[PDB]
Write a protein that binds this ligand. Structure first.
Ligand SMILES: CN1C(=O)N(c2ccc(C(F)(F)F)cc2)C(=O)C12CCN(CC1CCOCC1)CC2
Ligand SMILES: CN1C(=O)N(c2ccc(C(F)(F)F)cc2)C(=O)C12CCN(CC1CCOCC1)CC2
Lengths: 213, 213
């Protein structure tokens, strides 16, 4: 009615629609991610102590991206979820757009705020320590890769179950953009890749423990 | 009024007070924990491939205790939280007693049910695998100790934050038994010991990675 979010009966007063077009936000976000991924490729080649494999340099790109997303994008929510509706700022309009796939991000849901606080505070800084560790070949490098990836999967599984328990009321089911892209896909990225990185860290640490015997 | 839980205005109909005295439940639980800890001490001494240190055998006692609690006690909640009020089974009277420090366990809270579901399904069976692994000196033994310990702390931190965000409405503040013992202490056990076990697993795995170089 006055707003696009779900369920439709919510009385979300103080809401003001996005001032910018939606493509400035998604074009702008794509650039900063692009700059980061390419420069991570440059920084991996130059500043590494040993020649990293191609899939290893890509792995540092993933951790560099996650570090920025948790620290800056999700950090903004944890600070300003109280006044996110009706705010004219780049990150505020990103969340107003994203929250159409899950209205819990505008309502300041108790679980969502607490989960995001841990993600922004821990897995942001630790994602940067994984990147630094692999360049210098520090012994903690595979242990940190495990601790961050396990921490992300646990938060992501709780995210999907708690919504399923409510019955997906915070977003129209089966919608192409708001459901299958915003809710299913980009949340499932932190469910599948990280699972591949858990299997990798286990393999190298299992061999590390076997050689010590 | 008709019930002892908080906040006092809740209309918790279909509630029937505990049929047994409270001390049968606490005495009964103490015994099974006692039997488990002592037999873990016996099983550690006999069936270990190498002579374990004293603190290592105690560590297997902790994991054996955790495995039983998650699988059997918290498994019961995940199955029967729908009709926990008014039930007469032994474990139902345990939760009716425990839920006086946090009424979310009788209300079937969305976060609590989903957190407990993961606690019972994964962190119970993994706790048993830590115990088996250390007896046989399998290379995964310290990796599982790290994996098991990390998410228990993650679940515990989320448990305490979400209650703080609500303002501790689900239990009277400052009460000696219901607050400081049920809510603060026994939940803080999974906050502090597991943190000591994380530092232990890191210490042995950091050395494992250093020797492989
Ligand atoms: C609001 N978001 C957001 O805009 N992107 C996003 C989308 C596209 C790009 C790209 F391609 F342009 F670069 C970059 C970032 C996200 O990933 C989230 C939504 C999903 N969450 C994942 C959390 C992880 C912890 O568990 C809970 C779920 C993070 C923030
Ligand atoms: C209902 N409970 C319960 O009765 N005991 C309990 C109390 C005394 C004994 C003892 F001493 F007699 F042996 C044994 C067990 C618990 O520990 C919990 C309450 C605390 N939770 C901890 C979870 C962990 C995951 O994060 C969230 C918190 C587990 C169940």
């Amino acid at each position: 009615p006055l707003h696009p979010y779900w369920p439709q009966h919510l009385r979300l007063d103080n809401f003001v629609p996005n001032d910018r077009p939606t493509w400035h936000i998604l074009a702008g976000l794509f650039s900063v991610t692009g700059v980061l991924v390419v420069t991570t490729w440059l920084l991996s080649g130059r500043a590494a102590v040993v020649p990293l494999g191609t899939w290893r340099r890509l792995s540092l790109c993933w951790f560099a991206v996650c570090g920025f997303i948790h620290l800056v994008i999700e950090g903004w929510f944890v600070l300003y979820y109280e006044d996110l509706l009706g705010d004219q700022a780049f990150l505020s309009q990103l969340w107003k757009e994203y929250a159409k796939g899950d209205s819990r991000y505008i309502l300041g849901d108790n679980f969502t705020v607490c989960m995001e606080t841990i993600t922004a505070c821990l897995w942001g800084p630790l994602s940067l320590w994984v990147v630094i560790a692999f360049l210098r070949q520090h012994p903690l490098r595979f242990i940190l890769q495990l601790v961050v990836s396990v921490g992300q999967i646990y938060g992501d599984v709780l995210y999907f179950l708690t919504e399923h328990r409510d019955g997906f009321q915070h977003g129209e089911l089966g919608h192409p953009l708001y459901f299958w892209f915003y809710f299913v896909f980009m949340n499932a990225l932190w469910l599948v890749l990280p699972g591949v990185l858990v299997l990798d860290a286990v393999k190298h640490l299992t061999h590390a423990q076997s050689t010590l015997d």
